[model samples]
Structures are given as structure tokens and as C-alpha cells.
Target: LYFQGMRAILFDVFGTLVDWRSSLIEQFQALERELGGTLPCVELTDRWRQQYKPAMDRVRNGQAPWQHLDQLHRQSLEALAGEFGLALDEALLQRITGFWHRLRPWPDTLAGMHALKADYWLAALSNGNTALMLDVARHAGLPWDMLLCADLFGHYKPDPQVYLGACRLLDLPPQEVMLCAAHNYDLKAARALGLKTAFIARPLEYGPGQSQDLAAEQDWDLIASDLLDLHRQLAA
Candidate 1:
């Protein structure tokens, strides 16, 4: 099979390995208690996520200078603050902006990763900044042997450079590196650059309202229910 030729696996962290939506909502609720005021936690979480693509597209389209997700998130947060008619202080904004760092992994993420780690080289091919990714890794105890972050690559996923760059850094060809992501678009981009692709379904990536990427849109090299399935297939 195509996967047999792959020696290293690159993972998409946000949705593929971690549950960003739930984590953010949880953090938002915690913030409300700290501030001793009721905030529209659910609406804010949804709105914040709604801004994800537009923020990334700025850098992708070259309308803005290259910046990491942290900067993008903060900018989005500030815009959201204004839109919500909230005048949160800078310190509060900083704390809330740090929500990404406290993200918890999906139930099977760590176990599956450890299983796969026993037999293959594992690295994060995430759009998260280096520091952010590191914090998530530490918080979740994720077993990433290396981190291929957008900050270091100066570009985000779906950018050929980031995928190709990971292979270059690993001293492997695109064919030897498989990108495992929940997003079909990400896999499509990797496939275009000669990288193997695995789709891990994350139906609730956007919470119960998530309607996209519920299933593999194309015949990736492998499509699995979740990371555990991917590890089982790869380990075999």
C-alpha cells in the first residue's frame, strides 16, 4: 500500500489531534467566572472560530505580513472584543488569548500517538506557532518527536512550502512523509505536493454545529474514524 513507503508521519494538531472548539469554550467559561460577569461564552466561541479562516487568509493571500497564529488570534480576539461591545483590559485579553495553549487533546490522541510513535517518527505539521505548539504538547503530554510549525516555516498548512519543508527537514522525500489531518483541504494540498495523505474524521471540530469535513471528501491514502484507527492501520 502507499503508506508502506512512508517512514515519518506529520500530524495536523488543531482538529486532527486536539479538540480546539471544546477547549476554547471551556476556557471562555472559566474566564467569565474569573471576571465575575456572564459573557456569551457560546456565541463568543463560535464567533471566534468563525474568524479563523479570514485571519489565516490574510497571511495566505499576502494581504498581511507573515505572522503566526498567536498574533492572528490576538488580532481576531481584539476585533471580536470590539464587535461584542466589551472593553476587556490588555491583561485580560492576554489571558483569554492564551486559550489555545490550554487545548486538550481528543480522547484517543495521546494513546494513538504513543502507539504510532513506537514504530514511526512523529512530528507536528501544525499551523500553530512554535511556542503555542510546545505549550499544547506539554499540557497534553503529546508525544511529538519534532515540531514543524508555521512560525518556523513562515507559512501555514495548505502552503506547499510547509509540507515540503517538513520533508526537507526530515531528510526525506514527500512520498516518505504522510500528512494525517482531519481537513480534506489540507490533505489535498499535501497530495498535490507528492505527499501521502491520511484523513482522520473530526465531525465535531466546530462543536455540534460542525457540518464540514465530517467525512473524507476524497480517497486519501487512508481514511480512518480517528487517530487510533490511523495508528492501528499504520502500525500494522
Candidate 2:
């Protein structure tokens, strides 16, 4: 990555800034038992979320046309349900599908984001639409200065323009902006465009089918355990 004097930090929300994978399963479990005889909690969780990238890719490449992530997740979830041969009630599924809107932050998210915000201009750069990200922030009490949504750019991660767009809007060079994320592909995209990278491991973002991203794939500019840890290293 093009590391330079830091000016701002744009974060990936789904996995990096919050534990959406774990929270997603926890949220659904809070409602009712999954149709399968217990979806191997971790693996099922990883598998369900693993669909996220490919699902979004369909929209980005014009294969499926563009759509919001919430819609994509519901579609993907339906596929997963079929794979397990579980009969899900339509109305019950509707409520379960929208649970993304009610995700809880990781233990360190709120405090860490707040601590880092004093110096760095923190904003969300995520696949989730602006309104959805805003709602999640509000629901989870995540305090951010602003948000960057995929719909705004008509593209999503692995697109250099999307990463560069943040630096352009912030009036900073790519090196001055660090995109902290859990996904290696997002970091790679930013790196290719000369942006700095900070990777926080999201070992289980994709519930059952999580076969990658358990750690940083490349030598990132910064790799830390979590947001609070990143805040500590940045201060030094």
C-alpha cells in the first residue's frame, strides 16, 4: 500500500468495524431455531455470509444488474435454505432477512471508533447502501463522521475508482487515506490504487463456507487484532 502521512481512515463496516457474521447468527438465533438440526453455528454462519461477495459481484458486473445488499442477502439466504432442505415460513423468513438492519456492534466497535475519531476523519466505505449503513450506525451506536456507499459510485469493492473516490472527496492523496477492512480483496483493491491498508482479521465473516480471509493475505501497511488495537498502534 502507499503509506504516507495519515489524514483520514475509511473503514469497511460489515466485518471490520463490527462482528456482523457472529451477530447475524446471534440475531437469528434470538428469534428461533434454524430449520437445519443446528447449522454448525460457526460454519453455517461462515457459509451464509460467504455468499456476500459473489452475490455483490453479480450486480457489479451487470450479470444480475445492480441491487442493494439487503436484497442480495435475502436472495442468497433463500439459496442457502434450499441447500439445507429446510422449509422456512415466508413471513418468518421476511423478518429473518431484515435482521441485517439490527446487527449489534462488536464489543470494541463503538468505543474504538469514538477513540479513533478524535484525530482521524472516520467514515464507512461499505457495500451496504448509505441509508442502510446509516441505520446500522444508529442502531449499534457507531459514531462516524460520514458514510460512503456502493450505490453512490454504481460499483463496489475490488474497484479502484471506489477506493480512490474516498481520497478524492476528502481532498487527500491515496497514501494519506488508510482503508481499514476485514476483507483481503478490498485491501488489495485499495493497495492497487496507492491507498494505505489496515487489515483487522474477521475470521468468520462468511459463516460455514469461510475458506479464506482468516488473516491478512499480504503484508498490509498495518495489521491489528481490532479497532481498539489499531487505535493504539496509530497513536504510537
Q: Pick the lDDT winner.
A: 1
How does candidate 2 fare on TM-score? 0.83
lDDT of each: 0.87, 0.79
How well does candidate 1 match the true structure, expressed as C-alpha RMSD? 1.4
Candidate 2 segments whose C-alpha is farther than 4 A from its true place: 1-4, 33-44, 52-54, 82-90, 204-211
Clashes of each: 0, 8
Where model 1 places Cα greater than 4 Å from the true spot, the runs are 1-3
Candidate 2 local lDDT, 1-236, one digit each (tens): 12338979999998777767777778756655645345444444666666767768777778888888777878877887788666678896687677777677777788889889988999889888887888788889988887887877877876766787778888888878899998898999899898889998877556555677898999999898988999888887
TM-score for each model: 0.95, 0.83
Best by TM-score, which number?
1
